Amino acid sequence: CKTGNGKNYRGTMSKTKNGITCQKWSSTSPHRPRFSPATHPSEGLEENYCRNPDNDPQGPWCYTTDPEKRYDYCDILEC
Numbered sequence: 001c002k003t004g005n006g007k008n009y010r011g012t013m014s015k016t017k018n019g020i021t022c023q024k025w026s027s028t029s030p031h032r033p034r035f036s037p038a039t040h041p042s043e044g045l046e047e048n049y050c051r052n053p054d055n056d057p058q059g060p061w062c063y064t065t066d067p068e069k070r071y072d073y074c075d076i077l078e079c
């Protein structure tokens with residue numbers, strides 16, 4: 001969840017909505033989008049994070065090192 005859309009959180013480590021080990025923002029060759037532009041609200045996409053620099057108020061999104069488990073939000077404490 002967004003216990004602060006750029007202020008406070010915990011599951012932002014690198015785990016999806018439940019706790020699926022997110023990615024490191026590498027790329028689609030192995031597996032990972034091309035996220036990183038500055039025209040985004042923010043950019044807390046630190047190595048392997050979950051935030052909302054795209055458009056997912058419902059919850060901080062985040063992809064992962066693999067397809068079957070490419071994405072979902074982060075297991076960040078509620079808000």
Ligand SMILES: NCCCCCC(=O)O
Nearest residue numbers: 033035054055056061063
């Ligand atoms: N609204 C989420 C789309 C951007 C999240 C990253 C991705 O989909 O590759």
